Design a protein around this nucleic acid. Structure first.
Ligand code: EVP
Ligand code: EVP
Lengths: 760, 760
DNA sequence: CGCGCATCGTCATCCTC
DNA sequence: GAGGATGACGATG
DNA sequence: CGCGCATCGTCATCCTC
DNA sequence: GAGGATGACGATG
């Protein structure tokens, strides 16, 4: 028998014929790994090995409709290549011999995503063939993640904990050239030949023992065990925190030779890392209200001044260059676009100015132009929310031996409450609606004095619909409807989280023609659409209008939309998760966390300004002594000159002293006292240096005199003053667009509420 | 009647109903322009305007199979929306009234590609409905290409010749902020409202008069008028060259108000610009053997040192940042990959080192990994072929007010003859095979003395097949076949321009099973494939083997492949095109063009080294006079100090003098004599300055003494010395891969030639 | 570049009962 | 020997 | 990211005659 | 009033 249906399959020689019990099959993720596998098979052969590339995340089958199972074609190809049958038990070895392939070796990237894909495949095999997991049927191929090189020598490393241990236990570190490997395509032909040469180290077989592992597989993909996953991740996060505090290095895998691998260790040590990473990258933080993807772009934009505009494609390239982004520019351009939209419902405040078309409110925001068609630039509010004097306060990382972005930021407003937070993770998810900036500023000003904060309500910018609060953490939103004449009706505004094209295709189309059980309700509909406002004119029957009035126009046209707030899950200043209940709790927590840092900023700016003033004073004294003629540098050895300078009282660079004092947690230094060009030896510049040092002394005195607080008040005042101009320009943008002569239908407005709260 | 088939269509209100003669339809390219059109229609309305986005280059219908016409679905959608019929004449106004739309307004980018798309649409309409082009049925919408801004003032510009005229005729230039527009998506909502507000300036109607225009349309898309297009472009290129030489500014369009536009002017002024641009971007140059897309990347790589490796995505981002690339990063990543492949048949020499997988010789080179999976870095041969001292020799451009890449480069070898040249343009196309580098070096060394060059033969790197020359500019290539036993046969090497997967699917599959008229010839086939070499073992019938031997194995398995050389078309040092005939002609032309620049390089390096030495001498003299104590700068005004320095004999910066002398085609300057820090006032540094100036004097003396020639010989010697190490590493790469124990079948080889030359 | 299909937890409706 | 058909390739939609 | 289909001039075969 | 079904969303395969 042979296979000729799909061209992508590279069938082996004895596939389906005799000795099929030894014929294996390689499964690779994506299509790049197929190139590595084919390039490698040149050494082993084509008899017992076949390669078939996958597409991406495989459909979960433990809980899915049979129709959806039949819809996927990739699973159908997998069964057609292997030869499995749904209701056929495989107990005897003859049943295994019936199949066309003996073993299945999966190989993917050495990251969390490959681990997730492997878990999905194990679940797929176990859900419908439990007996095949006790005959050595599945196996894994692994690759190195980082290599070193120095004088024709290299050392392979498979796990980061092993690389960290090698760094901590070995001297002469950094002499080797580090080289990170992210994708399988990074390797070359020589590396592939070396990998397939050492089969006893990469090829790893699985092993099954004990029925408990079956529950473990369920523990990973049971839609009825959400709380079980919650506890399973909470215990792991607590253990990791305790181990980090005690300083004991945690355990890893793949270090020495491994003949087999238990499923229990496979799940409780590898997939949980994917779960933790996903929760870290898909849930915002209560401090900066951002995600690591957004944070990298915001840091890269802060690194350069960018006075002019900039293209999005080159911006993403620079972000990948400096922020160490390793998730594909395509997934990053969408995030950059999301950080700039300002239409109704998207964001009450933006950080990137909208130069171009960043998507209207018609096609789900996905109707944006190509990334090379659009331009962008930092808004005036970006550098105001983040004072430039806060870089020294926060802690950074050193991914890829490179000063990289920090873990959070310290704004002057809670960013979670201004731009919302919507994310789906593992075990927990997040859903936080928007609010109004002025109410937040008023509440913070009220709390700073000591008074009690006031209850707030989720609002939006440029929105005219009504919002009603019935139960705590529950809200209802209603749009705008009017009755122009006894026959016509007008829809002016739709509620948030509603798109004009979707609303039209899902409401006007079913109502225009008669459905299977309802007569055609509406008769005519016309659209008067703009970039921001909408206008629907619907003509119907007068009796139908009276009926809708008796029933309620909002219910008929689906204007009342409900929302709840029970997913208030965010990170902490330490890194743990908390289930928040009220917005005032987030406000008080942010207030205290911000209050803790005034002393740190004051203590950092103080001392540093004093040291700069002292350095200027030392430079002035050196210039004055040189003008006096005491210091002679005509033909004097560099060494003797340093010695005579020291006996004066002259010290090293205080900036270097502060850098050393910060880094605590080649001799003397007098370079800056001699790096000044001869231009400094004139009175025209001596006067400027004197006035500059006097200005620095005045600034230091004012800092010593002013309170550690009261800087917050000045910053808020400046922010409000800037927001006034920003909103003025935003309104002028519509005022220029304002046509003037246009249809302007006006009619009595019906405002209604649900008769029954129906509180749970 | 209504339309509900395609969702992308935004139907108007009176479409298909009454007053359809006034209902227009907007056609936009791509999908980004749909966002601009929809955002703009908010002001005009939804009654007489409808938008339908296109996909890209529309299929030409003047010469295409009816089956292919039926295959395209976009044309079917266009007819279904409009309502046209193939064999229905439209003469009376009632026939026009029968249609569902009155007019068609096309809008695209203001570049050459939009012009090409508009021409394709006009051809499509004229080919099957000649009568519709005399009733005001088609129209064009235009947008600005660049804008200026200074103090709430702006001036629109539609053509570059108009912008150049405004720059040349108006003072106070550069005060306005320039802003280039490339894509329609760049504009904002306010700009769209302003565009649709001034309908009398953008909306332009067409006009037809005289049957000659019909021939003009044929002149643009007649597959039987290739020579006519050749003459039509040659006359235009000659006219442009003469106008540039005379300095008279050429004519443009769209400047003042335009009620109509003739087809003759539409074709002889706009589409010809697209033809010229396409020929410029799709044909290599005889000087550097590159194309502008390759040239931009090669310049961007030259700008930075890049000692370490670099990612391809960030590299493309930097190229778009500095090289002013405006054709999409996706089209640029493929070019970057093409500039790095080194497998058999791709390139005899590469400029980017292959770190990763850049595609094997199996899937057409298209099996390369994702651009973020691969790394790259400049090869050691890049900076050797292009000496660093040649940037001053060539002329640059100032696209976007930015120092950008030059027009060509001056290597030490003809790059056209080493990496081939394959391109398809308009009116002309190019096809130049590869050659051997050592033969080129030997021929250049032979020509430099004065001897006669030798005939060469197209060769390839890492190739074992035979090459035969029968007619001039014609060649035949044969692979490698052997007879292992009286039954089996072995194929070792396939000819160039042949892919293993394609050769297998197009030869082994038809031969394995019996075709409609042939019995199954082969019986068994097995593959022993590697990354570089191939091995096919085919088992067949002994009688069939004798029959194939009687007929010829090369003919049976398609091993002999012919190639011709009649498309030797390249640019010139001036910019014109020439139809070359022999390779020796290209070699002699390159030799003379290179010989012309030795004097220029010598004259540039001379004088410049002398000026640097003079500047060092002036600095040393100033330091010596200061040590003597004659020059006093204690408390002296900046102005009086300059005056006393001048009376000494001290001059300005000679580097500035050379920069001014080059730029020919605020007073005194003594900054560098005072920008030296105090460290220079010690003997330890005075000795170093003295030795440095002595070294500069020696270098200048050697330059004055050596011949203007003989630098070419030293550069060639260094290049050969480096190529020795490069080839040694390349061979070692296979030697490490060399498995050792493997199947090594050896058999008698049959070498054959066509019995009849069959010369034309 | 556009549509192609996938995870993962809450939930607002949506179709039966 | 003598004519029509067609895909091959590369920068861009 | 993979396959989706298009131009444009020469030409090596490829299927009839 | 009471239960199962399902798509909605966003960073990534
Ligand atoms: C096809 O070959 C591979 C594909 C992938 C996936 C992928 C997989 C898909 C799929 C699409 C995609 C696609 O994502 C899409 O991007 C789109 C970009 O425009 C925006 C508007 O909309 C996005 C889609 O929301 C998203 O779904 C790829 C982007 O980069 C990836 O990593 C994605 O539809 C079918 O299955 C991974 C691979 O190996 C690692 C592959 O070999
Ligand atoms: C769909 O929406 C639009 C598409 C386009 C075209 C395009 C058009 C296509 C089409 C594909 C393409 C595609 O090219 C493809 O890229 C591929 C990239 O990977 C490599 C391996 O292979 C390339 C294909 O050889 C090439 O054909 C686009 C890339 O950027 C463009 O400019 C291309 O197949 C169907 O018609 C322009 C638009 O507006 C301006 C659009 O709105």
């Amino acid at each position: 028998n042979r296979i000729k249906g799909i061209p992508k399959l590279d069938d082996a020689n004895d596939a389906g014929g005799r000795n099929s019990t030894e014929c294996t099959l390689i499964l690779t993720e994506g299509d790049s790994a197929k190139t590595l596998a084919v390039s490698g098979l040149g050494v082993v052969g084509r008899d017992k090995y076949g390669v078939f590339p996958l597409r991406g995340k495989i459909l979960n089958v433990r809980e899915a409709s049979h129709k959806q199972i039949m819809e996927n074609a990739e699973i159908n190809n997998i069964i057609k290549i292997v030869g499995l049958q749904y209701k056929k038990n495989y107990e005897d070895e003859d049943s295994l011999k019936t199949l066309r392939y003996g073993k299945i070796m999966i190989m993917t990237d050495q990251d969390q995503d490959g681990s997730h894909i492997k878990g999905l495949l194990i679940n797929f095999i176990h859900h419908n063939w439990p007996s095949l997991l006790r005959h050595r049927f599945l196996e894994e191929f692994i690759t190195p993640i980082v290599k070193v090189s120095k004088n024709k020598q290299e050392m392979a490393f498979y796990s980061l904990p092993e690389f960290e241990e090698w760094k901590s236990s070995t001297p002469n570190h950094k002499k080797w050239k580090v080289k990170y490997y992210k994708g399988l395509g990074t390797s070359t032909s020589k590396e592939a030949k070396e990998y397939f040469a050492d089969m006893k180290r990469h090829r790893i077989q699985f092993k099954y023992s004990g029925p408990e592992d079956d529950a473990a597989i369920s523990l990973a993909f049971s839609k009825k065990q959400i709380d079980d996953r919650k506890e399973w991740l909470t215990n792991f996060m607590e253990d990791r925190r305790q181990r980090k505090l005690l300083g004991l290095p945690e355990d890893y895998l793949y270090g020495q030779t491994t003949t087999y691998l238990t499923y229990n260790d496979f799940i409780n040590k590898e997939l949980i890392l994917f779960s933790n990473s996903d929760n870290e990258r898909s849930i915002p933080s209560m401090v900066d209200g951002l995600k690591p993807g957004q944070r990298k772009v915001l840091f890269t934009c802060f690194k350069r001044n960018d006075k002019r505009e900039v293209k999005v494609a080159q911006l993403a390239g620079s972000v990948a260059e400096m922020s160490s982004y390793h998730h594909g520019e395509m997934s990053l351009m969408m995030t950059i676009i999301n950080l700039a939209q300002n239409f109704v419902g998207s964001n009450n405040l933006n950080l990137l100015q909208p130069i171009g078309q960043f998507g209207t409110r018609l096609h789900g925001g996905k109707d944006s132009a190509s990334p090379r068609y659009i331009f962008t630039m930092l808004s005036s509010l970006a550098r105001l929310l983040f004072p430039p004097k806060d870089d020294h306060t926060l802690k950074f990382l050193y991914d890829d031996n490179q000063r990289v972005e920090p873990e959070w930021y310290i704004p002057i407003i809670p960013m979670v409450l201004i731009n919302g937070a919507e994310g789906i993770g593992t075990g927990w998810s997040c859903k936080i609606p928007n609010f109004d900036v002025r109410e937040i500023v008023n509440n913070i000003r009220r709390l700073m004095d000591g008074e009690e904060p006031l209850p707030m309500l989720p609002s939006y910018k440029n929105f005219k619909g009504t919002i009603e609060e019935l139960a705590p953490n529950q809200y209802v939103i209603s749009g705008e409807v009017a009755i122009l004449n006894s026959t016509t009706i007008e829809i002016s505004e739709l509620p948030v989280r509603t798109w004009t094209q979707t609303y039209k295709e899902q409401v006007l189309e079913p109502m225009l023609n008669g459905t299977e059980k309802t007569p055609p309700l509406i008769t005519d509909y016309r659209e008067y659409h703009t970039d921001t406002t909408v206008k629907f004119v619907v003509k119907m029957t007068e009796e139908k209008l009276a009926e809708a009035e008796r029933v309620g126009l909002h219910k008929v046209f689906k204007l009342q939309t409900s929302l709840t707030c029970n997913s208030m899950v965010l990170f902490d200043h330490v890194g743990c998760l908390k289930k928040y209940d009220t917005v005032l709790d987030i406000l008080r927590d942010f207030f205290e966390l911000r209050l803790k840092y005034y002393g740190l900023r004051k203590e950092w700016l103080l001392g540093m300004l004093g040291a700069e003033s002292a350095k200027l004073n030392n430079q002035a004294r050196f210039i004055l002594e040189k003008i006096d003629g005491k210091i002679i540098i005509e033909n004097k050895p560099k060494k003797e000159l340093i010695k005579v300078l020291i006996q004066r009282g002259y010290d090293s660079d205080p900036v270097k002293a502060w850098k050393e004092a910060q880094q605590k947690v080649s001799g003397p230094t007098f370079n800056y006292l001699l790096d000044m060009p001869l231009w400094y030896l004139t009175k025209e510049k001596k006067d400027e240096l004197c006035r500059l040092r006097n200005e620095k002394e005045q600034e230091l005195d004012t800092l010593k005199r002013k309170s550690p607080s009261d800087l917050w008040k000045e910053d808020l005042a400046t922010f409000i003053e800037e927001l006034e101009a920003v909103e003025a320009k935003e309104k002028q943008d519509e005022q220029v667009g304002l046509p003037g002569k246009g249809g302007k239908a006006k009619g009595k407005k019906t405002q209604m509420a649900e008769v029954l709260p129906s509180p749970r």
